[PDB]
Write a protein that binds this ligand. Structure first.
Ligand code: A1INX
Length: 128
């Protein structure tokens, strides 16, 4: 399914080219601006352990997930991946633990050495 597809076909958007963050554009956005560091960003997402079944989803709380880009309020993979997204874009990310919660994990939700999969819809972003 979608995680395997990202493993097979996604682009590596890491600087190191260690395949730590793999991306597929699922629905193209408009604009020519991507967000830059400091911006306030609005998304809807669905996220899950890659080997898991149930999502954490913003829709389940019926409100968008807001954060500031590059300010370390979210995992390194979101800081990296959302910086590549256009407004209206839907992207799939697959993320190795080094760009998420690492060998320490983040229990109870995230175990040690967890790979993570998200679908992200970029709704909007505004400059600091
Ligand atoms: C490790 O803790 C969590 C991880 C994740 C979600 C968590 C969470 O408990 C704080 O709560 C979901 C409740 C919403 C409103 N939320 C998200 C955050 N703050 N509040 C942002 C989080 C503090 C950090 O989350 C992230 O950096 C990423 C990207 C943004 C969306 C949430 N993220 C997660 O890692 C989720 C997990 C995704 C895989 C399945 C388990 C949840």
């Amino acid at each position: 399914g979608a995680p395997a597809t990202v493993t097979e076909q996604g682009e590596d958007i890491t600087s190191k080219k260690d395949r730590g963050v793999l991306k597929i554009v699922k629905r193209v956005g408009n604009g020519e601006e991507t967000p830059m560091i400091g911006d306030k960003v609005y998304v809807h997402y669905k996220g899950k352990l890659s080997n898991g079944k149930k999502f954490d989803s913003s829709h389940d709380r019926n409100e968008p997930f807001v954060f500031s880009l590059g300010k370390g309020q979210v995992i390194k993979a979101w800081d990296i991946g959302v910086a590549t997204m256009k407004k209206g874009e839907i992207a799939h990310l697959l993320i190795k633990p080094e760009y998420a919660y690492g060998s320490a994990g983040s229990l109870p939700k995230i175990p040690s050495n967890a790979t993570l999969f998200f679908e992200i819809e970029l709704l909007d972003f505004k400059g600091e």
